[PDB]
PDB file of C-alpha atoms in Angstrom:
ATOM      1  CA  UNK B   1       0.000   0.000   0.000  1.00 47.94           C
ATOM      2  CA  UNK B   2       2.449   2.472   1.070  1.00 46.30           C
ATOM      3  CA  UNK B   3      -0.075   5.264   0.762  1.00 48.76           C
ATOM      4  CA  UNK B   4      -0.397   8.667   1.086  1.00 46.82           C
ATOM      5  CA  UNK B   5      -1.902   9.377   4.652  1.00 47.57           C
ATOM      6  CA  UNK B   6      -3.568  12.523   6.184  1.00 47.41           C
ATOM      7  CA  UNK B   7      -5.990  11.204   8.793  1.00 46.07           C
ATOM      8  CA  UNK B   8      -7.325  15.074   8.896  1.00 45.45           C
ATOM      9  CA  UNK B   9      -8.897  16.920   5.935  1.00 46.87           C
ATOM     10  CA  UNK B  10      -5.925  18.130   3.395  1.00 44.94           C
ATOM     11  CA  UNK B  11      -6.996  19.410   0.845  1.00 46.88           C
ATOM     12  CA  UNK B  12      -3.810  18.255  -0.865  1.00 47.58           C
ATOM     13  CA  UNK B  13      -1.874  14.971   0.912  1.00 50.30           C
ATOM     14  CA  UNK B  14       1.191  14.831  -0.052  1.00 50.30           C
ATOM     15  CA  UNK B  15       2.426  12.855   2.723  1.00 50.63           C
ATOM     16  CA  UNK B  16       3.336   9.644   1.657  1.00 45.19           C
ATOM     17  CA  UNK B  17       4.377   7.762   4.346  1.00 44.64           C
ATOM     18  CA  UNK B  18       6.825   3.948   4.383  1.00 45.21           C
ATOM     19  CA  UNK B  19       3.735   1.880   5.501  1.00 43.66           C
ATOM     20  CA  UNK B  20       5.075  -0.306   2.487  1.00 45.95           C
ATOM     21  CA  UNK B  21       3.188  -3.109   2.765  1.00 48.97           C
ATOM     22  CA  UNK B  22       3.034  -5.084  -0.523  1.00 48.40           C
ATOM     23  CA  UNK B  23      -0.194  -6.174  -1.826  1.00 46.53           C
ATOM     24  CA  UNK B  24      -2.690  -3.819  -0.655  1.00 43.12           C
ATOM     25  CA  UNK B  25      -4.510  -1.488  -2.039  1.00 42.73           C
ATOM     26  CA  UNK B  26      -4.583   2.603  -0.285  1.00 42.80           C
ATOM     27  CA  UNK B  27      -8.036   4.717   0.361  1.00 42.20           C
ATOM     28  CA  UNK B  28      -8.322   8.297  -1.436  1.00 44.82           C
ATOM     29  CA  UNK B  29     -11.610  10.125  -0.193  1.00 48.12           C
ATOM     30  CA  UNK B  30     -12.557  13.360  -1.364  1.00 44.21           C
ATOM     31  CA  UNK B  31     -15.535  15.101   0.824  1.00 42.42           C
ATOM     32  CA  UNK B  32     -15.348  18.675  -0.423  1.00 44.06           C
ATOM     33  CA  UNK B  33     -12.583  20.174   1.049  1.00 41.63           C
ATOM     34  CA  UNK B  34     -12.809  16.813   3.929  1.00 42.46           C
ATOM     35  CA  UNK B  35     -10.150  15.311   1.829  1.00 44.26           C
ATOM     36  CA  UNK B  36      -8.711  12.045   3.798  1.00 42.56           C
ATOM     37  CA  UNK B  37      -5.822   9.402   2.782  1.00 42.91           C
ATOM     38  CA  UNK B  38      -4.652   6.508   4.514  1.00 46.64           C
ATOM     39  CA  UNK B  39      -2.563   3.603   4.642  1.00 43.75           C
ATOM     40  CA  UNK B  40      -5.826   2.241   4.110  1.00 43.39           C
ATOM     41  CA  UNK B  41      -6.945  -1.781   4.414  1.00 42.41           C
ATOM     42  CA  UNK B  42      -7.037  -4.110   1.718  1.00 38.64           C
ATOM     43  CA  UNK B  43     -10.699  -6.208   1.078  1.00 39.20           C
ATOM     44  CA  UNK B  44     -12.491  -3.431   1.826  1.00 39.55           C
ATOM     45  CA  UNK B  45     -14.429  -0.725  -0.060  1.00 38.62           C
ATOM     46  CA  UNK B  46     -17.425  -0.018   1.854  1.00 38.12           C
ATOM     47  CA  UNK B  47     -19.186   3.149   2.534  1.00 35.98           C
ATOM     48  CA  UNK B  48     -20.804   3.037   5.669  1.00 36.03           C
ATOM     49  CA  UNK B  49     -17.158   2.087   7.447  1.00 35.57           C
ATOM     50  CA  UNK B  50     -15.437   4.913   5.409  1.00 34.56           C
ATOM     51  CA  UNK B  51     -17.809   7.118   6.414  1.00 36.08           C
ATOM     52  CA  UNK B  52     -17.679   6.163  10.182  1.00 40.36           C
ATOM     53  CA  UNK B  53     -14.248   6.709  10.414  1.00 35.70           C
ATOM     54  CA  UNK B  54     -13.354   9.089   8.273  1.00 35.86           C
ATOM     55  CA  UNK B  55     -16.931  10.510  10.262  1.00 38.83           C
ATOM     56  CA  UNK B  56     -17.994  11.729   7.084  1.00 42.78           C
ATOM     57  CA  UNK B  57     -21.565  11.608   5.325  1.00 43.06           C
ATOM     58  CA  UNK B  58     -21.020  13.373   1.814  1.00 39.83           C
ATOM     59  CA  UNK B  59     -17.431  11.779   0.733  1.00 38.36           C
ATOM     60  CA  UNK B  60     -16.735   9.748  -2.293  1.00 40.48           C
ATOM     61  CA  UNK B  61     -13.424   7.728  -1.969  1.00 40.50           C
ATOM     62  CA  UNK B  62     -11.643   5.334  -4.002  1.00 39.01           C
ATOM     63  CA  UNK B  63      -9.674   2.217  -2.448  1.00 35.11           C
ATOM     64  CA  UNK B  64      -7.095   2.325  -5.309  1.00 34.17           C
ATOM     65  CA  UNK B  65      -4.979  -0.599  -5.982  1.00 32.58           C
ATOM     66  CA  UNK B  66      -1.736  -1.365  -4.314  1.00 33.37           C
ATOM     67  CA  UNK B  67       1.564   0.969  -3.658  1.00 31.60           C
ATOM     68  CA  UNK B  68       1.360   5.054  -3.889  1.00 33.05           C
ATOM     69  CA  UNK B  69      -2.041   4.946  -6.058  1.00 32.83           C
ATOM     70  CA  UNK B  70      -3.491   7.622  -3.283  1.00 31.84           C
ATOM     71  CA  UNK B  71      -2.203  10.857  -3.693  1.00 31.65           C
ATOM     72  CA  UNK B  72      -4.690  13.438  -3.349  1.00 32.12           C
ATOM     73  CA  UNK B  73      -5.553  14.412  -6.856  1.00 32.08           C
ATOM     74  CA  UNK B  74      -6.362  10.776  -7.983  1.00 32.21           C
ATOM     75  CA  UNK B  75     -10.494  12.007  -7.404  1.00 35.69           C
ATOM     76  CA  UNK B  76     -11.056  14.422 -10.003  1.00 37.66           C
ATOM     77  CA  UNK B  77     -13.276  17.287  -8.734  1.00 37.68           C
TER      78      UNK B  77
ATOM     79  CA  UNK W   1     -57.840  30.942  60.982  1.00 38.76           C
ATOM     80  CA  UNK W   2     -61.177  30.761  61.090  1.00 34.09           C
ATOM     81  CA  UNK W   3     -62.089  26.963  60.035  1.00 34.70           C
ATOM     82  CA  UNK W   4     -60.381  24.307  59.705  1.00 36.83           C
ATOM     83  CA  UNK W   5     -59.334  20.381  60.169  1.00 40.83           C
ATOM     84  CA  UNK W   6     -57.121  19.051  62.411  1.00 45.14           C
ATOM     85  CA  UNK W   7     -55.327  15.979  60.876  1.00 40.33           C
ATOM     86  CA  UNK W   8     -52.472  14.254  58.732  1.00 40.71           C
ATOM     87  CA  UNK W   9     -51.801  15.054  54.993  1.00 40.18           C
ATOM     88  CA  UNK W  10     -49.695  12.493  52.729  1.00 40.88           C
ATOM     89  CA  UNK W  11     -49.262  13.226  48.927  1.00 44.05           C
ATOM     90  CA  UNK W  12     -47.136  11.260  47.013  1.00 43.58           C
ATOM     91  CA  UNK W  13     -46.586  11.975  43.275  1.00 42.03           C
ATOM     92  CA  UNK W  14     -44.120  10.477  40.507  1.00 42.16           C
ATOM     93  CA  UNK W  15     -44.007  11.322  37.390  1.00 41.76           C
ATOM     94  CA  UNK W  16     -41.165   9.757  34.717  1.00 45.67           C
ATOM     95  CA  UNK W  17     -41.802  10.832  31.130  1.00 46.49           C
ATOM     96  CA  UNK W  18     -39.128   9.485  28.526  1.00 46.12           C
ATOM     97  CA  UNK W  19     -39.246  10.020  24.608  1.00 44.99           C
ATOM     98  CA  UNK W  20     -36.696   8.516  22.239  1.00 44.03           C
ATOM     99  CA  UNK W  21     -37.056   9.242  18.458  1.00 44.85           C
ATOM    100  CA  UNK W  22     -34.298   8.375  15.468  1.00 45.45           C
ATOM    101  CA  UNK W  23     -34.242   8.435  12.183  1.00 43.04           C
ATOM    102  CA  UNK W  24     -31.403   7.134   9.919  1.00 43.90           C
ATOM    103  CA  UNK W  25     -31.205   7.469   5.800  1.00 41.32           C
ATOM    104  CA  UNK W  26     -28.615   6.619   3.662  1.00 45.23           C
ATOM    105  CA  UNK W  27     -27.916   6.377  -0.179  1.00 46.56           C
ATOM    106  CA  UNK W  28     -24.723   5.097  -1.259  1.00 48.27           C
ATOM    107  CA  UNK W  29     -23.333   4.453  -5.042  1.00 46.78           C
ATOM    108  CA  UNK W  30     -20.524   1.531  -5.161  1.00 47.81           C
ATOM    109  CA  UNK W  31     -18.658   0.873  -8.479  1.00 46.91           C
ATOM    110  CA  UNK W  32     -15.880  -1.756  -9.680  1.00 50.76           C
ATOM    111  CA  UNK W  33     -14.162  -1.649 -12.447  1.00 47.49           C
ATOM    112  CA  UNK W  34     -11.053  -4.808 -12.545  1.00 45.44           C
ATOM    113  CA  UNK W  35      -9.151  -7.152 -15.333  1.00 43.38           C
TER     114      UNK W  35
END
């Protein structure tokens, strides 16, 4: 995964981080300006647990495959 | 005074009023795209 991660809204995460991990993929969520990355969890890609942690009820997010797939811009608009 | 009764008064009230009322929506779109 070794994802971009910004647990607080950024509206541009640029910090990727060395939680390199191999085979899993990152989160990008865009809620407006609540922007959110993470060294996300692999076999996931549900909205109601984004949402709850992320605590976010608008957001559209993307759980991109694999190693630095997540920086902010991936979600156009 | 000019009337009265001599006696014992005991008045006991309770009262408990609860009200609990939630609503939840959601509407989510999920999309995969994979080869």
């Amino acid at each position: 995964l070794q994802c971009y991660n910004c647990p607080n809204p950024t509206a541009d995460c640029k910090t990727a981080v060395n939680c390199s991990s191999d085979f899993d993929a990152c989160l990008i969520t865009k809620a407006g300006l609540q922007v959110y990355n993470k060294c996300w969890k692999f076999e996931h890609c549900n909205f109601n647990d984004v949402t709850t942690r992320l605590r976010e009820n608008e957001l559209t997010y993307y759980c991109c495959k694999k190693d630095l797939c997540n920086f902010n811009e991936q979600l156009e608009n | 005074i000019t009337s009265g009764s001599m006696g014992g008064i005991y008045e006991y009230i309770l009262v408990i009023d609860k009200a609990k009322m939630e609503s939840l929506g959601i509407t989510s779109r999920d999309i995969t795209t994979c080869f």
